[PDB]
Write a protein that binds this ligand. Structure first.
Ligand SMILES: *[C@](O)(C(N)=O)[C@H](CC1CCC1)NC(=O)[C@@H]1[C@@H]2[C@H](CN1C(=O)[C@@H](NC(=O)NC(C)(C)C)C(C)(C)C)C2(C)C
Ligand SMILES: *[C@](O)(C(N)=O)[C@H](CC1CCC1)NC(=O)[C@@H]1[C@@H]2[C@H](CN1C(=O)[C@@H](NC(=O)NC(C)(C)C)C(C)(C)C)C2(C)C
Lengths: 306, 306
């Protein structure tokens, strides 16, 4: 029993972090096989940031301008290239700690673990969600660039995020491991709009199910509702619309608790219209939306990983 | 920028988890050098739990009754002993992945990372605090026993907790790595009282400092207070008294923000007396007490570990 914001074990990713230096800038790289991946603005100076021409900036860098370093051992770059917003440094030594891995571009509302690193060295791990506006609410300081988000599927690490930049309200933007940004962001220091952040309704429902599984039942009411009627209310409190897929995804949690999804929607409806009047649910005084239905099943049934 | 409930990287602890089986029971062990550590009630059957006599139960176990297993490799027990509530299984193979480590008994209010495991395999990592009543609010299912809490100091893992048991309200009790319980709990299935849980005031203050460092300043008021006057109010909302030590510990956070501790106490005072009126602080609608001043410094300045 119990419910906690839980990250994946980070052992398999720790051995893949190196330190990348180009002239003055130092940040983190991801070393898999004989390739190191890092944000391409490592080739920028502070002034270049306002309006970088990456092609032109890259023209005047040779392999020997890139200092790659795994612990005290020192790797040498035999080739570099730009793939979108990431730089791929080809090195002379395949990582002997390369795990089984994939690169995946995740969808908004999915969650993942971030291993925050500085100078190629792990500092900490936490779980976060891709917000519907394609930002994340992370914890990143200067030097954290190149830190990666990941999931695990048994033995296979799925890399999905690389950290690049911060936006005014302490929210964070980055790319997938192919260098494509999530959202409309670009890697330069010029004013940029993030859209409105909405609440991931299906995640809220899964967390309400986790509450119930852990005996926190007071919000369970006696009403029901329809999917169209719920969405009419959710959309006014800035919530994602619920679809029949979402209902199907919640099936396992609905079947374990004996509470139908539409019944749960009616309880959520009331929580949005009346607030929570001072109680908490699973120790929280807000509705939590950074647990997917999979995260809840995994945590409330004990899925392990190699 | 940003503030997250952050766990230590778990790589160095993952390689120390094994699976321990005795007759019917299977749980987790901690394998360091040639010793495996596990909860001693692994030698119990479901019936023995109501009133185990561990000495007598242990009398009828020999080395070959204990199946220890690291992945697919299979270790053999050449000796067993009971140290308080833990069992120390002497094995024939020193763990080649033993990190530099210590055993520490932590004090209430300190935080640590838990690597929740099942069948000797890491499932996830999260951060928690030793509550003032010597429980933790974790996330543990059947099979999680033997999972360990730890901190890191650069290269040295400090093991501080081993999970044993759950109490009615989904709170958890366990031992240090020498087998002594935290709190007055004993390892048998008989009614047992946990005391009242109080709020760790110095942790709340450090989190308020983290708020301010991250620009969340609305609760900063124009009043001040005295340590005796604050404690008179804190003690009525079930808060730990603040001492001059606590003030000294907060010095680094006070110096970074320019807000004196007593001034911060006056803001906290008002938050306890008026509630937070609907806003949030660092995304939370409750006062958070599971960040030590050290956790805040570490996260808001970027301490890394080997
Ligand atoms: C990494 O590059 C690093 N070296 O660690 C760094 C990390 C961030 C998180 C704390 C600083 N990222 C940048 O410096 C990033 C690079 C320039 C400027 N960057 C920013 O994140 C800036 N944000 C910003 O300009 N935001 C908008 C575009 C105005 C919304 C900072 C002001 C935070 C430095 C580039 C290429 C975007
Ligand atoms: C571990 O032993 C395991 N094998 O994983 C197990 C983990 C807990 C967390 C989910 C079950 N612990 C126990 O089974 C533990 C062992 C018996 C009974 N235990 C309990 O935790 C019981 N709690 C309990 O009796 N609580 C009090 C004492 C009434 C407050 C359960 C009812 C949860 C099984 C012993 C030796 C205490």
């Amino acid at each position: 029993s119990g419910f906690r914001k839980m990250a994946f074990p980070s052992g398999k990713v720790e051995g893949c972090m190196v330190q990348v230096t180009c002239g003055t800038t130092t940040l983190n790289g991801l070393w898999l096989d004989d390739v190191v991946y890092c944000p391409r603005h490592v080739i920028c100076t502070s002034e270049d940031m306002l309006n970088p021409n990456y092609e032109d900036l890259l023209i005047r860098k040779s392999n020997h301008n890139f200092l790659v370093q795994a612990g005290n051992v020192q790797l040498r770059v035999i080739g570099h290239s730009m793939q979108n917003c990431v730089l791929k440094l080809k090195v002379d030594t395949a990582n002997p700690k390369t795990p089984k891995y994939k690169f995946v571009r995740i969808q908004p509302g999915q969650t993942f673990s971030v291993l925050a690193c500085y100078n190629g060295s792990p500092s900490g791990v936490y779980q976060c969600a891709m917000r519907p506006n394609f930002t994340i609410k992370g914890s990143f300081l200067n030097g954290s660039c190149g830190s990666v988000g990941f999931n695990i599927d048994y033995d296979c690490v799925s890399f999905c995020y690389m950290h690049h930049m911060e936006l005014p309200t302490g929210v964070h933007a980055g790319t997938d491991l192919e260098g494509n940004f999530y959202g409309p962001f670009v890697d330069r220091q010029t004013a940029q709009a993030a859209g409105t952040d909405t609440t991931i309704t299906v995640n809220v429902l899964a967390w309400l199910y986790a509450a119930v599984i852990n005996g926190d039942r007071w919000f369970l009411n006696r009403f029901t509702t329809t999917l169209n009627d719920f969405n009419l209310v959710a959309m006014k409190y800035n919530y994602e619309p619920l679809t029949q897929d979402h209902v199907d995804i919640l099936g396992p949690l609905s079947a374990q608790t004996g509470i139908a999804v539409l019944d749960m929607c009616a309880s959520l409806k009331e929580l949005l219209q009346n607030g929570m009047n001072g109680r908490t649910i699973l120790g929280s005084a807000l509705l939590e939306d950074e647990f997917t239905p999979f995260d809840v099943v995994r945590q409330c049934s004990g899925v392990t990983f190699q």
